Amino acid sequence: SQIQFTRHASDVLLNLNRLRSRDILTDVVIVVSREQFRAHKTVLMACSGLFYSIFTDQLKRNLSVINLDPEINPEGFNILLDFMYTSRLNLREGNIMAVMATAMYLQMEHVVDTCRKFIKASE
Amino acid sequence: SQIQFTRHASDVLLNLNRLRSRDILTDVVIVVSREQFRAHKTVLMACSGLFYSIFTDQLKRNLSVINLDPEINPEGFNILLDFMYTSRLNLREGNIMAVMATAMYLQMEHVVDTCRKFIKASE
């Protein structure tokens, strides 16, 4: 009865990334050391147990700024934020440990497991 | 270099639909005759030329209520809103003309073309 549009979810995500790139309807700034990253809380909640847990709570739902642990790796966060908006995870030898540790902190279980498989499949 | 997560966009969209179902971070009511439908403007902009054109404009970006033409078919709209959040288009003989006319009004070109192919593939 239904008609499956196989590229619709990917097209939506690309358009959501275009809106982020233009600061259209962005509602939060994530501060990570000296970095600031704007985003849509909806996308953060959709991709991260940590963000889901923060914004589902009525007490913190309307926060416009989130300060992460100053010890959180800014390149690791940037890689994971790009992943959330693209479905593409840039894992490399130079960044794997930073990305895996950041994904554990953001409670991105499927990404952590993928980093594990990565470590296992690499030297 | 990148690692493609083939189900990430679909998982994001499902989670965005869960947020809609719970009225979490919904920011607009679409009024269609005697019906009210809550949604995320980001998702409306991602799926519809009409909503994109309305909310990209700074003048209308912060509108919390949109009244559609009272002549817009509420079942047609409901079908298309469900499609936006699911990638699944419930086309049937009893609704095809209402959905196609509503998709033209919402400027959902790929959905209109799919309705055309539907008409062509049916008696």
Ligand SMILES: O=C(Cn1ccc2c(=O)[nH]c(NCCc3ccccc3)nc21)Nc1ccncc1Cl
């Ligand atoms: O699933 C996610 C985000 N998301 C992505 C990856 C991932 C993860 O690895 N762990 C968790 N743990 C929190 C799970 C939880 C707790 C309480 C109730 C329901 C779900 N969450 C993760 N978001 C979501 C869930 C349900 N409705 C709406 C949304 Cl936006």
Ligand SMILES: O=C(Cn1ccc2c(=O)[nH]c(NCCc3ccccc3)nc21)Nc1ccncc1Cl
């Ligand atoms: O593409 C869409 C929505 N969307 C879905 C289907 C569909 C359609 O069939 N026609 C149009 N016409 C408006 C096209 C336009 C006009 C001016 C500038 C760019 C694009 N839009 C459609 N949204 C979008 C585009 C670019 N950045 C961000 C977003 Cl959210």
